Design a protein around this motif. Structure first.
Motif, PDB file in Angstrom:
ATOM      1  N   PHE A 130       0.802  -1.226   0.000  1.00 32.21           N
ATOM      2  CA  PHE A 130       0.000   0.000   0.000  1.00 32.21           C
ATOM      3  C   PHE A 130       0.831   1.270   0.000  1.00 32.21           C
ATOM      4  O   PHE A 130       1.938   1.318   0.528  1.00 32.21           O
ATOM      5  CB  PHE A 130      -0.946  -0.014   1.205  1.00 32.21           C
ATOM      6  N   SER A 131       0.295   2.325  -0.610  1.00 33.57           N
ATOM      7  CA  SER A 131       1.105   3.529  -0.815  1.00 33.57           C
ATOM      8  C   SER A 131       1.555   4.227   0.442  1.00 33.57           C
ATOM      9  O   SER A 131       2.427   5.101   0.436  1.00 33.57           O
ATOM     10  CB  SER A 131       0.300   4.554  -1.632  1.00 33.57           C
ATOM     11  N   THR A 132       0.937   3.837   1.548  1.00 31.10           N
ATOM     12  CA  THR A 132       1.333   4.435   2.818  1.00 31.10           C
ATOM     13  C   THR A 132       2.753   4.087   3.203  1.00 31.10           C
ATOM     14  O   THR A 132       3.339   4.773   4.038  1.00 31.10           O
ATOM     15  CB  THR A 132       0.353   3.948   3.893  1.00 31.10           C
ATOM     16  N   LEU A 133       3.307   3.028   2.607  1.00 31.01           N
ATOM     17  CA  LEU A 133       4.708   2.712   2.836  1.00 31.01           C
ATOM     18  C   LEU A 133       5.681   3.404   1.882  1.00 31.01           C
ATOM     19  O   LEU A 133       6.894   3.205   2.001  1.00 31.01           O
ATOM     20  CB  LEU A 133       4.976   1.208   2.718  1.00 31.01           C
ATOM     21  N   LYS A 191      -3.207  -1.898   8.121  1.00 34.87           N
ATOM     22  CA  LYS A 191      -2.642  -1.016   9.154  1.00 34.87           C
ATOM     23  C   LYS A 191      -1.123  -0.993   9.188  1.00 34.87           C
ATOM     24  O   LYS A 191      -0.515  -0.038   9.683  1.00 34.87           O
ATOM     25  CB  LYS A 191      -3.165  -1.379  10.546  1.00 34.87           C
ATOM     26  N   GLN A 192      -0.423  -1.996   8.670  1.00 34.94           N
ATOM     27  CA  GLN A 192       1.029  -1.916   8.630  1.00 34.94           C
ATOM     28  C   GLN A 192       1.498  -1.608   7.210  1.00 34.94           C
ATOM     29  O   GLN A 192       2.706  -1.560   6.981  1.00 34.94           O
ATOM     30  CB  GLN A 192       1.669  -3.214   9.112  1.00 34.94           C
ATOM     31  N   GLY A 216       0.303 -13.076   8.761  1.00 35.62           N
ATOM     32  CA  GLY A 216       1.534 -12.741   8.059  1.00 35.62           C
ATOM     33  C   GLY A 216       1.221 -12.007   6.774  1.00 35.62           C
ATOM     34  O   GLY A 216       0.081 -11.636   6.507  1.00 35.62           O
ATOM     35  N   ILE A 217       2.272 -11.803   5.973  1.00 30.40           N
ATOM     36  CA  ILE A 217       2.061 -11.018   4.753  1.00 30.40           C
ATOM     37  C   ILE A 217       2.302 -11.840   3.515  1.00 30.40           C
ATOM     38  O   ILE A 217       3.109 -12.757   3.441  1.00 30.40           O
ATOM     39  CB  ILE A 217       2.974  -9.795   4.850  1.00 30.40           C
ATOM     40  N   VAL A 316      -4.758 -13.492  -5.804  1.00 31.10           N
ATOM     41  CA  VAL A 316      -5.493 -12.298  -6.157  1.00 31.10           C
ATOM     42  C   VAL A 316      -5.300 -11.243  -5.077  1.00 31.10           C
ATOM     43  O   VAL A 316      -5.684 -11.434  -3.922  1.00 31.10           O
ATOM     44  CB  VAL A 316      -7.010 -12.558  -6.291  1.00 31.10           C
ATOM     45  N   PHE A 317      -4.695 -10.152  -5.477  1.00 34.67           N
ATOM     46  CA  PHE A 317      -4.556  -8.975  -4.637  1.00 34.67           C
ATOM     47  C   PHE A 317      -5.706  -8.032  -5.016  1.00 34.67           C
ATOM     48  O   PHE A 317      -5.629  -7.347  -6.032  1.00 34.67           O
ATOM     49  CB  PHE A 317      -3.209  -8.307  -4.800  1.00 34.67           C
ATOM     50  N   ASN A 318      -6.730  -8.107  -4.170  1.00 30.91           N
ATOM     51  CA  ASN A 318      -7.938  -7.324  -4.403  1.00 30.91           C
ATOM     52  C   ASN A 318      -7.852  -5.986  -3.669  1.00 30.91           C
ATOM     53  O   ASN A 318      -7.880  -5.878  -2.445  1.00 30.91           O
ATOM     54  CB  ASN A 318      -9.184  -8.102  -3.997  1.00 30.91           C
ATOM     55  N   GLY A 319      -7.729  -4.928  -4.470  1.00 34.22           N
ATOM     56  CA  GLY A 319      -7.554  -3.571  -4.015  1.00 34.22           C
ATOM     57  C   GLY A 319      -8.837  -2.756  -4.026  1.00 34.22           C
ATOM     58  O   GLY A 319      -8.786  -1.535  -4.173  1.00 34.22           O
ATOM     59  N   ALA A 320      -9.951  -3.442  -3.877  1.00 36.28           N
ATOM     60  CA  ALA A 320     -11.254  -2.819  -3.654  1.00 36.28           C
ATOM     61  C   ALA A 320     -11.183  -1.977  -2.383  1.00 36.28           C
ATOM     62  O   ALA A 320     -10.214  -2.019  -1.636  1.00 36.28           O
ATOM     63  CB  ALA A 320     -12.328  -3.889  -3.574  1.00 36.28           C
ATOM     64  N   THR A 321     -12.240  -1.203  -2.169  1.00 36.23           N
ATOM     65  CA  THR A 321     -12.401  -0.323  -1.020  1.00 36.23           C
ATOM     66  C   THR A 321     -12.006  -1.041   0.261  1.00 36.23           C
ATOM     67  O   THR A 321     -11.223  -0.543   1.070  1.00 36.23           O
ATOM     68  CB  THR A 321     -13.860   0.165  -0.891  1.00 36.23           C
ATOM     69  N   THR A 322     -12.557  -2.246   0.405  1.00 33.04           N
ATOM     70  CA  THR A 322     -12.036  -3.131   1.446  1.00 33.04           C
ATOM     71  C   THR A 322     -11.191  -4.205   0.770  1.00 33.04           C
ATOM     72  O   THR A 322     -11.698  -5.113   0.113  1.00 33.04           O
ATOM     73  CB  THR A 322     -13.133  -3.749   2.309  1.00 33.04           C
ATOM     74  N   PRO A 323      -9.878  -4.064   0.868  1.00 32.72           N
ATOM     75  CA  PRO A 323      -9.012  -5.040   0.190  1.00 32.72           C
ATOM     76  C   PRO A 323      -9.133  -6.408   0.857  1.00 32.72           C
ATOM     77  O   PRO A 323      -9.387  -6.500   2.062  1.00 32.72           O
ATOM     78  CB  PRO A 323      -7.607  -4.500   0.376  1.00 32.72           C
TER      79      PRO A 323
END
Ligand SMILES: N=C(N)SCc1ccccc1Cl
Length: 330
Positions: A130-133, A191-192, A216-217, A316-323
């Motif tokens: 996420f762009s926050t990083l 959140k991370q 985990g990630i 699948v990396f789902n980047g919808a409003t709620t990922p």
């Protein structure tokens, strides 16, 4: 819109995967490491310290009519193996597998550490966390996916990594011919800043499934599978002669071994990592001690579903409003 690009292992061990990326006008093609564990798109460039470049392809923004210096912006990042890079920033046109983003921040390396220099197959990174990083200062920048999202047929990307073979990154659509059975979706915490989820358990070889939550990630930019010490001890205990070696830096095993599979849970579904996937070969050239593909996360602070795990699935990396994250067998 959609994009579709082939991703290729950099070596015989699938230590990482590279994907061609078109940057600038006229296009400059660089092979980038798509990294769902970070959020910076950086490249080797004409600005990189000459002694720190050894065979990579570089981006030369002065040859691109669409490149613009992003005034005052700088960046600096480090990775899991302690490597790092830093530099300044341009905006330019970036295309991946036919999908084009204008005004993408392209972070130009002035400095890279030795591990990057030493790897001539990787021309840079393309972050997909996420762009926050994103590390750009003083104005944080968006990732390629975040910039493309509004244009995509569906706000998703998928990772289909091969075992000792090429795979695919798709943007904007799910290829229903690329997996078997159905896709199981699971909740994500952002959140991370990661694609952070909770596995439902594991099994070792033909062993019974242990129901246990493992947070985990999903990290295409990590080679191996890093899990709690209890889980990893349970796995290597099924391999004759395996042992944790402090000198080597993790679990090693006799190269003569046949490894058992490892199953991880996604909701009520199960993904099976074949034992051969867990073999990362001699610890040094000609050695009969081989490096394990499942290692302890104790010490890291987080569990990492790295390429060893992700390549066993269509993800699948789902980047919808709620990922969310989706996993299927393939
Ligand atoms: N994927 C990345 N760029 S960093 C992955 C990682 C490696 C070691 C420790 C923590 C993390 Cl998030």
């Amino acid at each position: 819109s959609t994009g579709s690009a082939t991703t290729t292992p950099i070596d015989s061990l699938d230590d990482a995967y590279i994907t061609p990326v078109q940057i600038g006008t006229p296009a400059q093609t660089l092979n980038l490491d798509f990294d769902t564990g970070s959020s910076d798109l950086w490249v080797f460039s004409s600005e990189t310290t000459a002694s720190e470049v050894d065979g990579q392809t570089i981006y030369t923004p002065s040859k691109s009519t669409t490149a613009k210096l992003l005034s005052g912006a700088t960046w600096s990042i480090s990775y899991g193996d302690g490597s790092s890079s830093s530099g300044d920033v341009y905006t330019d046109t970036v295309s991946v597998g036919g999908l084009t983003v204008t005004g993408q921040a392209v972070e130009s390396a002035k400095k890279v550490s030795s591990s990057f220099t030493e790897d001539s197959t990787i021309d840079g990174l393309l972050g997909l966390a996420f762009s926050t990083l994103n590390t750009v200062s003083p104005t944080q920048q968006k990732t390629f996916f975040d910039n493309a999202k509004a244009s995509l047929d569906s706000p998703v990307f998928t990772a289909d990594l091969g075992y000792h073979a090429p795979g695919t990154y798709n943007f904007g659509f799910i290829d229903t011919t690329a997996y078997t059975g159905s896709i199981t979706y699971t909740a994500v915490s952002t959140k991370q800043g990661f694609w952070e989820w909770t596995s439902t358990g594991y099994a070792v070889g033909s062993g019974t499934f242990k129901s246990t939550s493992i947070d985990g990630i999903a990290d295409t930019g990590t080679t191996l599978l890093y899990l709690p010490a209890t889980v990893v001890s349970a796995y290597w205990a099924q391999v004759s002669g395996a042992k944790s070696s402090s000198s080597v830096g993790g679990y090693v095993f006799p190269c003569s071994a046949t490894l058992p599979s490892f199953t991880f849970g996604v909701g009520s579904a199960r993904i099976v990592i074949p034992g051969d996937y867990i073999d990362f070969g001699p610890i040094s050239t000609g050695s009969s001690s081989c490096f394990g593909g499942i290692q302890s996360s104790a010490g890291i602070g987080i569990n990492i579903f790295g390429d060893v795990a992700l390549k066993a699935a269509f993800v699948v990396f789902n980047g919808a409003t709620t990922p969310t994250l989706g996993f299927a067998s393939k």
